[PDB]
């Protein structure tokens, strides 16, 4: 077997907007999980339904790495049974989630003087997302009682909202890059494990 491409995910030059979150399937390889835990670079390293220690002693049919950018304030929403704009409209974790949430401040890379407007999130939606759903829809949101007819305007809004990350913002309002590892065990032969 060969090593798993964690650098392809964690060290990616540009990250995705939370609404349009990226997923990477890791399979048929071996990967060490300890170094990351003692990376000295992760502001957040929560694990759910599994141990943050000796996790490397394990195995999985498939591992999924979901990357995106959100504020520091919203990192607390990348957990099961959470509520807020991100949990409800952007990225939803199931209650029975089995994996780790790793986040770190990327103010130096992702915020810009005058705003970095590449990072977006869904501000409006008719309903809450089901766990692991993804809405890349850019349909006009009808806030008023009268219909929009697909035309943006008064009481008719574009669903996505930009963050406009600036370095002078508070630590809570700064961009944070997030990688959500998901450990999948199916009733088929396993593919990823390595001590």
């Amino acid at each position: 077997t060969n090593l798993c491409p964690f650098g392809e995910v964690f060290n990616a030059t540009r990250f995705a907007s939370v609404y349009a979150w990226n997923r990477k399937r890791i399979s048929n390889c071996v990967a060490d999980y300890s170094v990351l835990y003692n990376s000295a670079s992760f502001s957040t390293f929560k694990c759910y339904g599994v141990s943050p220690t000796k996790l490397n002693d394990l195995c999985f049919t498939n591992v999924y790495a979901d990357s995106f950018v959100i504020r520091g304030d919203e990192v607390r929403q990348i957990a099961p049974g959470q509520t807020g704009k991100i949990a409800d409209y952007n990225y939803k974790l199931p209650d029975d989630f089995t994996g780790c949430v790793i986040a770190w401040n990327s103010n130096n890379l992702d915020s810009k003087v005058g705003g970095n407007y590449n990072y977006l999130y869904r501000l409006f939606r008719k309903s809450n997302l089901k766990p692991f759903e993804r809405d890349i829809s850019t349909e006009i949101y009808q806030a008023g009682s009268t219909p929009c007819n697909g035309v943006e305007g008064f009481n008719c809004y574009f669903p996505l909202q930009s963050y406009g990350f600036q370095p002078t913002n508070g630590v809570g309002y700064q961009p944070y890059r997030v990688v959500v590892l998901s450990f999948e065990l199916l009733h088929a032969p396993a593919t990823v494990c390595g001590p």
Partner: antibody
Framework: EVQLQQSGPGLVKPSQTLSLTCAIS??????????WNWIRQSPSRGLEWLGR?????????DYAVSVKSRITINPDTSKNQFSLQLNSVTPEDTAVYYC??????????????????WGQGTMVTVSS | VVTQPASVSGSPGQSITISCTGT?????????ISWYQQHPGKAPKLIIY???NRPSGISYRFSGSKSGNTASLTISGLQAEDEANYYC????????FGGGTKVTVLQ
């Protein structure tokens, strides 16, 4: 250039019905972004809004309360016109009548311009 | 019902300001206020939309503002071509015009 060609001046005898036509050219009477209004003006009354007709999937009419019971605005997709009818006229209806397009901006930021384009006006005198 | 002064006069070069006052249900309800210019025997023309917006073609001599229940128009550098009637109008479902202001350029 959007232009509004109106229905030629004349006299309406009392108790009869006033009828005027506004013919649009350079725009569609069923525009997403438009409304088609009638406005009248008299030296003593000033500018008086009469009502609008607009198409957003369905056809719609708003009227002003001082004429609500006597008025009808009628779009004509066939001819690309809309019409005004005012029942039971009296000298009080002597006025210059205008058709105007109410225009909203549906691109980037929504703008509400108001009456951006006006017909030249037709003078109606109600007299016996 | 929306009040405008009947008559305003001015000399060339001066600056003028037409008051347009109404109710919380007419002018202060929204910021969909529009101003119109009318020369005699001609149709009105939009010169200001949304309180301060100048449609393309209108000089900067034309300014618009709002405070409270009074929208207001201002003409700087009063030229002789500015002699005309002026009306504010407000959207609130229905459309309300002010009574009008005849603007004289002294000669």
């Amino acid at each position: 250039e959007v232009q509004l060609q109106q229905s030629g001046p004349g006299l309406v005898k009392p108790s009869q019905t006033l009828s005027l036509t506004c013919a649009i050219s350079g725009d569609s009477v069923s525009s997403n972004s438009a409304a088609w209004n009638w406005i009248r003006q008299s030296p003593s009354r000033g500018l008086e809004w009469l009502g609008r007709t607009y198409y957003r999937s369905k056809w719609y009419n708003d009227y002003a309360v001082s004429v609500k019971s006597r008025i009808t605005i009628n779009p004509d997709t066939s001819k690309n016109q809309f019409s005004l009818q005012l029942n039971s006229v009296t000298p009080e209806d002597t006025a210059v009548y205008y058709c105007a397009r109410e225009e909203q901006q549906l691109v980037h930021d929504y703008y509400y311009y108001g009456m951006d384009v006006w017909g030249q006006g037709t003078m109606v005198t109600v007299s016996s | 019902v929306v009040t405008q002064p009947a008559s305003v006069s001015g000399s060339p070069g001066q600056s003028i300001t037409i008051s347009c006052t109404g109710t919380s249900s007419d002018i202060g309800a929204y910021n969909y206020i529009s101003w119109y210019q009318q020369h005699p025997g001609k149709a009105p023309k939009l010169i200001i939309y949304e309180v301060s917006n100048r449609p393309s073609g209108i000089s900067y001599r034309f300014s618009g503002s709002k405070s409270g229940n009074t929208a207001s128009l201002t003409i700087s550098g009063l030229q002789a071509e500015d002699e005309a009637n002026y009306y504010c109008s407000s959207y609130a479902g229905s459309i309300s015009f002010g009574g009008g202001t005849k603007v004289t350029v002294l000669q």
